[PDB]
Structure 1
């Protein structure tokens, strides 16, 4: 398919033709480049905006035009409309992909199975509203008459990463009183930690499971339920109704949540068309909404919804996530770059790169197309990154002087939470300079000039130059926001969510399944029973057998 599309053949030819042209050459030609290769979205509240500047790239107009034609030829916009209308675009699982519904502020009806799913979203949202308002107000009391000061979220993967990244990002909008803890480990270690950290009389446990029997998570949950029960009993406090005051559920399995001791009025549902890596917007986000409250969660949802609207209605050339996706395709698929750095210059976004690893690589780390049959081109790249400043006395050495071309998203804010201090100006001088540095480089001649002005030996100058030269012509996107509020954050996540949709559409893959984990799960089930003192296995390959056999002969 894709290897024989005119539009891709056209891009090959332009990569061959203009690929070696320095980034700086495209600025020397036209003096409005910054303007023509940047997009600003009005976030429609409080002077906030989301702005992408993709100017610092190996892309001219002929290329930019070829990239937009690829997206038309692949029918990206139409595939998106169908997703947005509840079509079962998750082909291999036969389901809708409706994270857009979870933040559909306008209540545009969306029909799955002869029902408007917005009924259900708005019902669970309004259920969360009433619940969180009652916890955050003080009115909800644990078994002894005390208000709640801790929330411990139980689960793993997309049931942990989202809530973690988002409550971190938004600490300045959060009730500082109630501490949030996130337990993801199979061993009870992190759970035991938090139980010897919290007063159980002032705490709620969130259990995140759709069937509400899932073995790992329901284990860590019983750790809590058992500690709660042991604690009441020793101190002469009755257990009657007690789990109902210290436990809530993110689930559909009404009677099994009720058997567990939870009041089903406190079972916050979500649906099969909410994928794990697209779930913070749903009831999975309950810990976020506890932490920052309802109005702020609605702002978060709204900033996403503003991004959905921008993405659905805006023609490709001016369409922010589309252009984001398309510069990523230029690098991933024609330059052959294997990686994507995400570098937020705001310490609150410190967990954003990890989140974007889940979202991007779990979605687009695929080898086959929907129609089935191997992909003919590179799919998703390896996402990495750390929060700005930090990475700078680390792996920036390599982005700058190494032999790998790596696309970098620099993300930053115009304003700072702390109005007074010089901290922020200094930080943003680095944010602009790094992308400037990557593009322009520093010449043999410029270095020579400097080293002469330092009065270097006439001799140890010619052999020193090359260590201090930078090539430049290394790409970077600069992404800015006026301020990192809930709503800006929601727009940033949604932007990446649709960047991912767009890349996977163009490649022909299903972005919304995850069959890649199955193999490891099945081979582990078959190994567990073989782990016993003195046992030798022979039924695997030699390495697996050796390793297993070393474990069996040396453990306890």
Structure 2
């Protein structure tokens, strides 16, 4: 088709326009002055079922009354969100354009509810691989696995790209306190072997395993980096006169399905960890792609991380939309992105260990829902995914806060925080949390002309210099925030925060009618680049592009080496 019009003509969507048109300008503060229990009514707490841990969302600091909330839930129902999620959870082929299932929840399906794809239960496979990762990680971490010289392993360099790198990085970072301090992990992803050469002159090769992530195990990009590592290993044994016999098998493993191609590389296929087509890159940490994670925090902590996500999964499947945390999260987001016209979404985690989270979510959210067409194959009638940004609130806790407070863009803010701290050193945590609660307060209440006037008289300010200074120091308030709390950032807690955002992205994509699980958007750039490449040579002039690309390619060609 040409253009959808479907969603644009739902009774629920029109009804939400009217409510935006009518109640849009009411202050966030006004909604609290009416109901003294607004906090409770506009928050959901999930029991995480271990150690008094929990995940809590307070979405009360928003421009949403009960009518608006009612309409948003109506929208989710009218659009079949719950039924779409059930199909996905059952292994139906909801990734319509690639005609495959989307089954990251199978990877953490602790109850082992049989999920049937192409006449087979995929849980034999999930569980088989998990048990294989268990046995392998146990032996690396205990020191029983020995390199070619007889030494235990102290380094893990993971070779991959994009999604197969960002999860493992974010998560092993997020959970350092649970990690074996002893063995260090590196994550190579860049095409030029700068990073690989960096890590090679840092690690003692006798003491290091390299994980090679590649489904086909041919991907020129990561196999080039793999080869550098392999060539260095062979080189290093050669010089120091050590047998190469069985060497690569002792220092390399694969995340792949291509049994014979891995075996050709010199890897032992007992150390090939499979994953499947229905694991999208941005949904893969939970699978064998997470092997460096499990090496780092061990098998039990990985199971906890998986369990966290599964508790999230059950919550999301079983709980009616008013009280369903990822649903509400998605709805308040749709409210800002689709009626307020907010192009962005900040994610501000007040825990230094989560410093990589916002980047992970950029991938997760923007690559899933950064789409221009519906499954039905019409052009979208409405805004889709927002631009995601953010940083950890420990450090700076100001850089761009100036603009969130006094600039002219309403930016939805997810503040994420923990009650408990992984160390009782002074009052560093309290000071941090005082800022955490204070930022969301400041955003909502602001500081009015009269408050500043009363404050500036007290400063003992000139009578005239005061009047023109007032506006500079005022704060509009009425700016939204979500406060997400966890008791403690444990494997299980992290797993639930990740799954929450995943189902948030699910919900939004279903409402907008897009395929959240394909990523066609990268193809053009690649095709044009393979074609530009032969043309980058000394003195070459090109004419087969537009004038800008031509002049750029041509400046490079005449000025290069």
**Category of TM-score, reference length = shorter chain:** over 0.9
* Range that drifts further, 388-397 or 279-288: 388-397
Secondary structure at the aligned position of 1:295 is classed as helix
Asked if residue 112 in structure 1 is aligned to residue 112 in structure 2, the reply is no
Q: Deviations over 1:107-159 (max 9, x none)?
A: 00000000000000000000000000000000000000000000000011001
Asked if residue 96 in structure 1 is aligned to residue 101 in structure 2, the reply is yes
Q: Deviations over 1:449-490 (max 9, x none)?
A: 000001000010000000000000000000000000000000
CA distance in 2, matches of 1:489, 1:392: 22
**Residue 154 to residue 126, structure 1, CA distance change in 2 (3 Å):** same
**Residue 554 to residue 529, structure 1, CA distance change in 2 (3 Å):** same
Secondary structure at the aligned position of 1:495 is classed as helix
Q: Deviations over 1:360-411 (max 9, x none)?
A: 0000000000000100000000000000033522100000000000000000
CA distance in 2, matches of 1:78, 1:390: 42
CA distance in 2, matches of 1:446, 1:316: 40
CA distance in 2, matches of 1:173, 1:421: 22
CA distance in 2, matches of 1:520, 1:417: 44
2:191 is matched with which residue? 186
CA distance in 1, matches of 2:220, 2:136: 27
CA distance in 1, matches of 2:158, 2:421: 29
CA distance in 2, matches of 1:543, 1:314: 54
Q: Deviations over 1:286-337 (max 9, x none)?
A: 0000000000000000000000000000000000000000000000000000
Q: Which residue, out of 359, 377, 383, partners 1:378?
A: 383
Asked if residue 299 in structure 1 is aligned to residue 299 in structure 2, the reply is no
Q: Superposed, which structure 2 residues align to 1:342-421 within 5 Å? A: 342-421=347-426
Unaligned runs of 5+ residues in structure 1 are none
Structure 1 vs Structure 2 CA RMSD: 0.5
1:53 is displaced (CA, Å) by 0.2
1:491 is displaced (CA, Å) by 0.1
2:49 is matched with which residue? 44
* Range that drifts further, 387-396 or 6-15: 387-396
Secondary structure at the aligned position of 2:455 is classed as helix
The number of residues matched between the two structures is 556
Secondary structure at the aligned position of 2:25 is classed as coil
Q: Which residue, out of 210, 217, 235, partners 2:215?
A: 210
Secondary structure at the aligned position of 2:329 is classed as helix
CA distance in 1, matches of 2:171, 2:336: 29
1:210 is displaced (CA, Å) by 0.3
Secondary structure at the aligned position of 2:100 is classed as coil
* Range that drifts further, 492-501 or 411-420: 411-420
Asked if residue 235 in structure 1 is aligned to residue 247 in structure 2, the reply is no
Unaligned runs of 5+ residues in structure 2 are 1-5
1:420 is displaced (CA, Å) by 3.5
CA distance in 2, matches of 1:239, 1:126: 30
1:267 is displaced (CA, Å) by 0.1
Q: Deviations over 1:253-272 (max 9, x none)?
A: 00000000000000000000
Secondary structure at the aligned position of 2:539 is classed as coil
2:80 is matched with which residue? 75
1:184 is displaced (CA, Å) by 1.1
1:419 is displaced (CA, Å) by 2.1
Secondary structure at the aligned position of 2:397 is classed as helix
**Residue 391 to residue 4, structure 1, CA distance change in 2 (3 Å):** farther
Secondary structure at the aligned position of 1:390 is classed as coil
Q: Deviations over 1:32-77 (max 9, x none)?
A: 0000000000000000000000000000000000000000000000
2:3 is matched with which residue? none
CA distance in 1, matches of 2:547, 2:425: 63
CA distance in 2, matches of 1:393, 1:472: 17
2:459 is matched with which residue? 454
1:9 is matched with which residue? 14
Q: Deviations over 1:336-363 (max 9, x none)?
A: 0000000000000000000000000000
Secondary structure at the aligned position of 2:138 is classed as helix
1:421 is displaced (CA, Å) by 1.6
CA distance in 2, matches of 1:175, 1:481: 24
CA distance in 2, matches of 1:419, 1:467: 39
CA distance in 1, matches of 2:238, 2:339: 66
Q: Deviations over 1:179-222 (max 9, x none)?
A: 11011101110000000000000000000000000001000000
CA distance in 2, matches of 1:420, 1:32: 35
Secondary structure at the aligned position of 1:257 is classed as helix
1:338 is matched with which residue? 343
